[PDB]
Amino acid sequence: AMDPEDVVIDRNLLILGKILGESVMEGNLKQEDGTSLKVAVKTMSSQREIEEFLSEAACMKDFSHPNVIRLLGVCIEMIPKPMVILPFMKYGDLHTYLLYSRLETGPKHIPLQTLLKFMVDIALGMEYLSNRNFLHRDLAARNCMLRDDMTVCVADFGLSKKIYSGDYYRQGRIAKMPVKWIAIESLADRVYTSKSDVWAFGVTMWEIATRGMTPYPGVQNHEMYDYLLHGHRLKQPEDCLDELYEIMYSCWRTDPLDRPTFSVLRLQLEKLLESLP
Ligand SMILES: Cn1cc(Nc2ncc(C3CN(c4nc5ccc(OCCC(C)(C)O)cc5o4)C3)nc2C(N)=O)cn1
Ligand SMILES: [Cl-]
Ligand SMILES: [Cl-]
Ligand SMILES: [Cl-]
Ligand SMILES: [Cl-]
């Protein structure tokens, strides 16, 4: 296979460890020196040219923002199967972290200002992706990672789409996306815009504010489109600042043109956080 951007890492340099999630695995990557590096490995019927997976991975390897995960490379192993090499993040995903915090043994009770800072981190990463014409298409707390220094990075770009680029071979997976994070207009035919990500960002904010609750208690996935069509939205979480709830609600306006951009959301959240004692 041709790799013009040199994103492929030799398969012999990678040693696969335990399963982190389901798939994501732990791994050890031998560097130029005798040293080993702890990494994570993501592995994902009519398929596109593998050269395009490598080109997309090479483009993401050039992402440089503290709130966006940075791909290390791709390892190919045999029918070639690509595996994405990522920095190892021992704290894991934000969604599980929020649930663990509601246990005596988990992280301490998360202060309201730490919850807000997690949202600022995500809006900063999304502003960076949005400005580069990337649609995440799977934004949720389970797809945000906690760095060792407790800053959040947006991650899991496996089903993302650069605006105007080809997307035929992702359609089958896009059709299976969890319905409770999808914008009302994107539910009918699974067609996404930057405003679809803004809707998902509002849902993600609500997940952070509720400390990991599943969106829309009492509403089943099959009832979701009709529920939103009737104008119903996620309810204000207990102790959620009214100002914060209004920022979340602006992400779910029926007309996508009425929702704010990530730059506006980000500034609104930074100002709200600064105003707190
Ligand atoms: C229990 N536990 C779990 C951990 N750590 C983890 N758990 C889950 C993840 C997910 C898997 N990640 C992920 N971000 C990605 C971005 C891009 C990508 O492909 C782009 C190329 C192309 C478009 C062509 O597909 C694939 C990606 O996969 C976040 N990561 C870790 C970690 N990094 O350590 C600790 N404890
Ligand atoms: Cl992914
Ligand atoms: Cl296409
Ligand atoms: Cl789309
Ligand atoms: Cl709700």
UniProtKB/Swiss-Prot annotation:
Residues 14-273 form the Protein kinase domain. It is found in: Cell membrane. Not expressed in normal B- and T-lymphocytes but is expressed in numerous neoplastic B- and T-cell lines. Highly expressed in testis, ovary, prostate, lung, and kidney, with lower expression in spleen, small intestine, colon, and liver. It comes from the Eukaryota. The modification Phosphotyrosine is found at residues 164, 168-169. ATP binds at residue 38. Autophosphorylated on Tyr-164, Tyr-168 and Tyr-169 in the activation loop allowing full activity. The active site is at residue 138. Belongs to the protein kinase superfamily. Tyr protein kinase family. AXL/UFO subfamily. It is linked to Retinitis pigmentosa 38: A retinal dystrophy belonging to the group of pigmentary retinopathies. Retinitis pigmentosa is characterized by retinal pigment deposits visible on fundus examination and primary loss of rod photoreceptor cells followed by secondary loss of cone photoreceptors. Patients typically have night vision blindness and loss of midperipheral visual field. As their condition progresses, they lose their far peripheral visual field and eventually central vision as well. Interacts (upon activation) with TNK2; stimulates TNK2 autophosphorylation. Interacts (via N-terminus) with extracellular ligands LGALS3, TUB, TULP1 and GAS6. Interacts with VAV1 in a phosphotyrosine-independent manner. Interacts with TIMD4; this interaction enhances TIMD4-mediated efferocytosis. Receptor tyrosine kinase that transduces signals from the extracellular matrix into the cytoplasm by binding to several ligands including LGALS3, TUB, TULP1 or GAS6. Regulates many physiological processes including cell survival, migration, differentiation, and phagocytosis of apoptotic cells (efferocytosis). Ligand binding at the cell surface induces autophosphorylation of MERTK on its intracellular domain that provides docking sites for downstream signaling molecules. Following activation by ligand, interacts with GRB2 or PLCG2 and induces phosphorylation of MAPK1, MAPK2, FAK/PTK2 or RAC1. This is Tyrosine-protein kinase Mer. The lineage of its organism: Eukaryota, Metazoa, Chordata, Craniata, Vertebrata. The chain holds residues 578 to 862 of 999 of the full protein.
